[PDB]
Amino acid sequence: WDLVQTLGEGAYGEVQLAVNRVTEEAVAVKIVDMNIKKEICINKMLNHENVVKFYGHRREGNIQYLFLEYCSGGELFDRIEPDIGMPEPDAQRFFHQLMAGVVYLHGIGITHRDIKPENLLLDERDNLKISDFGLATVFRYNNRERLLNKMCGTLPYVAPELLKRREFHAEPVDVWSCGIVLTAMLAGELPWDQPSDSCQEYSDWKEKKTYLNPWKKIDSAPLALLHKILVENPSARITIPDIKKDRWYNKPL
Ligand SMILES: C[C@H]1NCCC[C@@H]1Nc1ncc(C(N)=O)c2sc(-c3ccccc3)cc12
């Protein structure tokens, strides 16, 4: 493989675009200097259209190479116009695909714990794929669930129970982050810096002050679904089987 260019760079390491010397086949290579062992272990379990395909891995010295399907459409983050978002049919289409991916992971007892537009890739046909399983874990062993207690994710995307409870159910945490992603796609704005009564924007949402931004930019139909997902009590929060039945979710656009 010839490393053509950087696709992403950070504290975690880097992602390179690699093109095959003879075939001209393009793949993405995640290069990490030794967590990653768990990322590899989780990746080996996955097989679905709405998850970044894992080809395999190779360790050279103390550096890990993860061979992944190349997603030429880039991050969902870059499709979100600041303070605008994107057209409602596009947001709906990406939300459907996001839900399909999350259903798949939850079905095999895996929680992502880092759902955000920067961790959602688009392929050459604009198909959405869940990416970066470095914070992911097993929450169900054999029809038997375990509660989680890890402080994973970026505060604007995290569910409020992470700040309140000693331990919590895995699935409502991913459902909440998907709701934040949906808000960002529809209005191009994160609704609150923190999911706490101490954050004015969070208190405003709980008080139903939807004449304020970002809610004033969102249509009544997706707003009604957002009112069901962004529920503080994880026990009262909408489950994915009920999201699949929502009026806006099933509205042809
Ligand atoms: C998704 C991002 N989450 C934070 C860590 C970095 C990560 N970046 C990437 N990871 C993997 C791939 C892949 N599997 O193809 C790609 S592709 C790409 C891209 C393509 C086109 C334009 C602009 C960017 C970025 C990227």
Q: Residue 178 has which token pair?
A: 């998907």
Closest CA to 9 of 118, 123, 157: 118
| Angle of helix 88-107 versus helix 170-187 axis, rounded to 10 | 170
Eight-state DSSP code of residue 2:
E
Active site residue 114: yes
Q: How was this structure determined?
A: X-ray
Instruction: Judge whether 10 is annotated as a binding position.
Output: yes
Closest CA to 83 of 198, 218, 199, 194: 218
Instruction: Judge whether 13 is annotated as a binding position.
Output: yes
User: All domains of the chain, ordered by start, with CATH?
Assistant: 1-81 (3.30.200.20), 82-253 (1.10.510.10)
Instruction: Judge whether 124 is annotated as a binding position.
Output: no
Q: How far is the centre of ligand 1, averaged over its atoms, from the C-alpha of 208 (Å)? A: 37
| Angle of helix 170-187 versus helix 220-229 axis, rounded to 10 | 150
39 touches ligand 1 (CB under 6 Å) = no
How many CB atoms are closer than 10 A to CB 84? 12
Q: Resolution of the experimental model in angstroms, please?
A: 1.9
Q: Point out which residues pair with 28 in neighbouring strands.
A: 17, 68
> Which string of DSSP letters, residue by residue, matches 84-110?
TB--HHHHHHHHHHHHHHHHHHHHTTE
Breaks following residues of the chain (C-to-N distance > 2.5 Å): 34
In ligand 1, which atom is closest to the CA atom of 78? 23
70 touches ligand 1 (CB under 6 Å) = yes
